[PDB]
Amino acid sequence: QNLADPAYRRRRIIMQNMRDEELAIAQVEEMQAVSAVLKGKYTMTGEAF
């Protein structure tokens, strides 16, 4: 009932994307922390790395 312009869609999607990337960074930080102080033998592995 109330459409939005493509540029408004652009700003919405980029804000959502940066929020998602920040969430991914938080995820990886938390994973490293729990691996580290859960075993002390903290691997760092993954394809293309």
Using CB under 8 A, which residues numbered 1 to 49 contact another protein?
2, 5-8, 10-11, 14-15, 17-19, 21-22, 24-25, 28-29, 32-33, 36-40, 42, 47-49
**Cβ pair 43, 35 in contact under 8 A:** yes
Within 8 A by CB and 6+ apart from 4, the residues are: 12
Chain centroid to CA 27: how far? 7
Rule CB under 8 A: which residues touch another protein? 2, 5-8, 10-11, 14-15, 17-19, 21-22, 24-25, 28-29, 32-33, 36-40, 42, 47-49
